[PDB]
Amino acid sequence: FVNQHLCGSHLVEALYLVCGERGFFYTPKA
Amino acid sequence: FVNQHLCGSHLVEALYLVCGERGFFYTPKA
Amino acid sequence: GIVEQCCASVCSLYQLENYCN
Amino acid sequence: GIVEQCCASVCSLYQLENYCN
């Protein structure tokens, strides 16, 4: 699921699954 | 969609929609 | 944090927006 | 940033994990 183009909710969903209890930051402007 | 219990992917999904181009931080340990 | 406020309890827009960049 | 690396181009685990807390 990670090694593809991931946009919008798809990207957010990959971050959620990978990062787990760490959480993550989603900075699309940065 | 916001004024309810939001957990896991559901929460992440609400942040994504509300925050839009700003993005967000998801810090479940903090 | 967000889990206590939005998962264990009912979320709000006001609170959700505190986590936007 | 993440969009250029993972949306406009093919993502990676290595890169995705740079955005974990």
From Swiss-Prot, chains C, D:
It comes from the Eukaryota. Disulfide bonds join C6-C11. This is Insulin A chain. The lineage of its organism: Eukaryota, Metazoa, Chordata, Craniata, Vertebrata. The chain holds residues 85 to 105 of 105 of the full protein.
